[PDB]
From Swiss-Prot, chains A, B, C, D, E, F, G, H:
<dbReference type="GO" id="GO:0016787">
    <property type="term" value="F:hydrolase activity"/>
</dbReference>
<protein>
    <recommendedName>
        <fullName>Probable hydrolase YcaC</fullName>
        <ecNumber>4.-.-.-</ecNumber>
    </recommendedName>
</protein>
<keyword id="KW-0378">Hydrolase</keyword>
<dbReference type="GO" id="GO:0005829">
    <property type="term" value="C:cytosol"/>
</dbReference>
<dbReference type="GO" id="GO:0016020">
    <property type="term" value="C:membrane"/>
</dbReference>
<dbReference type="Pfam" id="PF00857">
    <property type="entry name" value="Isochorismatase"/>
</dbReference>
<comment type="subunit">
    <text>Homooctamer composed of two tetrameric rings.</text>
</comment>
<dbReference type="GO" id="GO:0016829">
    <property type="term" value="F:lyase activity"/>
</dbReference>
<dbReference type="InterPro" id="IPR048239">
    <property type="entry name" value="YcaC"/>
</dbReference>
<dbReference type="InterPro" id="IPR036380">
    <property type="entry name" value="Isochorismatase-like_sf"/>
</dbReference>
<keyword id="KW-0456">Lyase</keyword>
<feature type="active site">
    <location>
        <position position="117"/>
    </location>
</feature>
<dbReference type="InterPro" id="IPR053152">
    <property type="entry name" value="Hydrolase_YcaC-like"/>
</dbReference>
<dbReference type="GO" id="GO:0042802">
    <property type="term" value="F:identical protein binding"/>
</dbReference>
<dbReference type="InterPro" id="IPR000868">
    <property type="entry name" value="Isochorismatase-like_dom"/>
</dbReference>
């Protein structure tokens, strides 16, 4: 029937679009403590799984502000495309070149705002033949209407809507591949899971 | 794959349907301060991008009331079709004529109520072969159920659900085309963005 | 493109499924004051537009309770199928016979609970070739999850999700067909509209 | 048109995935009192309808914890696959073997978390040709975003989204098949229905 | 300890302040169907218990609009003070004179907006020595912040916050005083109670 | 300063007012699964701590319905006052005589609806000198406005607003008094605690 | 009884504390469109009623940012105290001296964040003998918990919780004092009122 | 008037009650990411201001679980009272002796669950003459009803309801006392503030 097009840690690249200091103030559909944790979780999983990662920003030398320091620090050697004008990152030639240079068929995309910086390149990438996976809990926007309208638009085009924990699990496939590593990622980003670990660890 | 059918500032017309004084009191799915800002934002972007715009009202000489003054004042030369009876604007011959006279393939539609004044002509237009883009945050209705039911119906038919900021960004494409102009539109309609500008401006 | 399959007052029948006194206590996804008004609005529009209407109940001589008095009183000559056991009304031969006897291609369906008494016959009817329109604001269920899951299932099958005011507007098409009649229906079921009428009437 | 692919009590198996003590603490999209009742309702209906049932857990000898006692106690002879590493149950050979051994075409799936333990095997099963029915109110996850993203993904693939009461009704088809039995299931899991029964019973 | 200052049907007057057609459009803290039902319930109970009732409006010949027709029709002989400018009804001499002429110590107050038309006269009345009971569910305002701030202010001054059903029960005291009358009031304004009545009646 | 007037298991009585099958359908401020669990938790703790308990109903032979079976079954020897007309239970002589016969200074009260069946007797009791503790999560009403207004009124009079778990902990004081007993109460009424217990037990 | 301590336009001063561009990004308990409108409404009413107004900022030459431009522009001659370190404005000598120099007994306070920049000086002022009125809808903070805790603290101390429209009406007292002026204030800050005005005006 | 009883960094002690790994799973009134951040923020501010801090746990060798690792690690020399049975920490002699040994008049309290582990000792402390400040956003419970009922009870007794950021600002008083220190605390626990800092720093 419909094939299950699942994330393959050897055929996926991560695109982090415009998670900038100024732009994050516009994010109100997901509260800040949760949003910050989710964005950092996504960066950590990209690093953990060793997925080619591409960073891009929009007019960072203005109100939009610089890329949040964590991402910059975490991916010092990753392609960093500071777009001076193109709103849709896919319209930037350097950006597309970097994406295609990863040689990956699957693109895991997250950024701000959801309906512009994520949706535009997601739609462009789908037209180009890529398998697109949107991390909806690591992408932010004005409110639930701007968010849900974007979800509808991306889903309609064929984008798979996923969340960071789901992304990590589909990529990892098996705990035995590295229990401690995945457990650390989860403990660092899911207070409830960390608590379960604490109790289990002190008891055993 | 699925082509990205994106807004083209040279191939799009804006249809503002029944944003009337009386009818706005029926809008309860989007709070008034946000709704007013969004509707005015849509009018401002239509003017900014110079998109052929069509205004229409339903039984304005009754409880429905007159078109909100801002729109009337902003588009004094635009086609203004006061429909005496047709609920679906597409059933009004003058309305369809005005729409087709714009010569635009893409129609950006917003109005009240979402499930009637927006959905009916959106569905009619899709049947006629137009590419329809619904501005969900500049369209209002009774509640979330009447709204979401309409979204489902329009999406099912092929309408692209968008929000005003997304619409502006897809139309503009590149900041460099006119930075100050887009920045002004954003500053006037996004308090958070205006604040970022204020801080940046006083510092630089 | 996709044809706009709109309600035709001459080709539509209304199916009111299990709006029973006991069963209404299970409805918690739509608050009671709004739900009661919406159900009565649907009955009033069915009567106003003279649409063949079919009433049905499930094990009414038990906890489920009798059909709410208003509907019984409003459609004294309509087919009334008290199903002794079949959960999906479409599984009741008398019910299907009554539906087909209306000779109508379009079926406007509402009832309780949304995911069972509305969804089951809606899906059965779609398989039989009928054009189905679900009145989502006149159908009730346990909570938003049971509701939204049902919406997804019905939409997936091809059901058009609509709300009562939208249904009335698509059926009427033109105010001039009978202004006072439609205005009365609206005034009786939309407090906000009634208020607009009051102000307009005392002023003119 | 689209066939109504409805649950058949003779052609359906139930898969209960990772409803573990530790993992249930991660469920925050559905409040605990409702979630517990729903999960137990699903187990009770599986038992009532005599549907082949498969239990599976993920790294139960760790923070994830043991399967909740109720399920273990209710299905002592059911296949119980304690997966030591595979996140997607479908990747476990014993699990798939047990599923296929039931000889059932329809799979009713529920578990935690929705977007991983339910979605992954649901998608895998759809690819294998099974008719999948997801019990959305007996599956739990972090929040509404992780949940709704998963719903979109499963629906997109062809999964039918259902809720436990709907599942029971589609399976039973007719009250007369066993009134007391279904009534007991409902009374035990729907406080509102139990109240209707109490009043009716004391009066009659 | 603190005395229970309860409503006495022989020492209470009802003040209905500014429930006008225009002003009701400003009420967004309580949805319209519920609000309409609650206001009409309060009018019905005032009439039922034969309580001296005072109607008052603010600049009714302007955007504020006329008093909702039902109240005017229900209390044709009640004092009706059309205030031409005084915002706080207590500042209008005719209004205060009317309140004092009732000879009642207890004042049941409701109106729109709650923080102005209800709060101002309630605070004035408390200063004057009256026992004030505010009907919070028959008073409307902009949002929950304007509402809750007013509740705090009124409660801080000593006003007793009540809701229409509670008001009716405190006034009635005993069902046996007139079962049918109170039952009718409840049936007409509480859909859930009406349903209970329908089931009970058809069975007995 | 202000003395901590805490629950004393030897000086407290429990008043369960009108938790009737019909009346529970009116409870919409607290969802049914949680509400049922909370009411049964209060009944369980009253039995566990051997507190003198008084059951009372209002017009049970009518739409209001019988007392929920569990309470009747749990307190077979408790005073059971079927009030034929008095809305405020304190106005019923048998009720007050029973309360006073317990000899308890502290009264733990819960019932439906909170603003009438709980608030009225609570206010009456406070006037009489009793220390009143309202169990807000085992008392139900129409919505949050009817609930919060009642809380304000009760708190204003001096009632202490508590919830069942807090009630249990304040009465118990020390785990060591009977660990297993309190643990069982908690396990039976708090799914999260039960899960903690399951994991801990299987591990130790 | 308790005196109604109402706003007197001749004995009130307005304190606008820290409505800075940077600090406004921290405000998430009230959405931005509404918040901006409310802050500007308060500034407009302060100017309209000619109330002595005091502007103050905290570390404006840093992340906190400059005062929003509108307030600066609207009150060019008002005392403007840039506090270099004192968090509670009352601890700044110039600030207190300015407040006392107004000679006003009543202080209308608003600012960000509500639990610090508003609450601290409000509590200080109350201790000093001033009558404090907090504008809760023109004060912003992190979330509803930080907000409601502050309301509790301020109310507990004796502050009167008000909202901008209520503030305007209490100060104005009578429409006839200047109908057009108050009407303009309302029209500019309440979309629903503006709509009422539009319909009324076009009709008359 | 009422004195402003403000936090004094030299006369305040911090009581962290039962923030245990198991018990945190019961916290559902505040989402986990925010709750974790708030608890860690309170621990950080207690350490920053060098306030005598007391850690206490309830039956930690059981389902309740161990104290979250961060608090243990942050306060290695703080009194740590493992209570073997006393639910209200004030009933534990070592606990009270430790509180009194600090010599502090003001007690900043936080813990889980708010209506038991925080409320009980807060009420006990108030009776003993202490000035109690409850950190409502670093205290967790089952839901909003259990939370708000506790707030009411604590406030009624005289406790001051505060939140961590407010606590930090009231203790600090002046930025100049140590700008970098307070800024770091804020940056580490308020993503919005951190973003403001990032933009400001890169620009200056």
């Amino acid at each position: 029937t419909k094939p299950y097009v699942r994330l393959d840690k050897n055929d996926a690249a991560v695109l982090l679009v415009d998670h900038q200091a100024g732009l994050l103030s516009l994010v109100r559909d997901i509260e800040p403590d949760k949003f910050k944790n989710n964005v950092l979780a996504l960066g950590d999983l990209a690093k953990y799984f060793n997925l080619p990662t591409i960073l891009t920003t929009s007019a960072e030398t203005g109100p939009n502000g610089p890329l949040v320091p964590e991402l910059k620090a975490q991916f010092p050697d990753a392609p960093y495309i500071a777009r001076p004008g193109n709103i849709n990152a896919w319209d930037n030639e350097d950006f597309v070149k970097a994406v295609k240079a990863t040689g990956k068929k699957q693109l895991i995309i997250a950024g701000v705002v959801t309906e512009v910086c994520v949706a535009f390149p997601a739609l462009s990438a789908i037209e180009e033949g890529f398998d697109v996976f949107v991390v909806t809990d690591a992408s932010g926007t004005f409110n639930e209407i701007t968010r849900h309208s974007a979800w509808d638009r991306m889903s309609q085009a064929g984008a798979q809507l996923m969340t960071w924990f789901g992304v990590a699990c589909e990529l990892h496939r098996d705990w035995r591949n590295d229990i401690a590593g995945l457990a650390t990622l989860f403990s660092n980003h899911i207070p409830d899971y960390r608590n379960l670990m604490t109790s289990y660890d002190t008891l055993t």
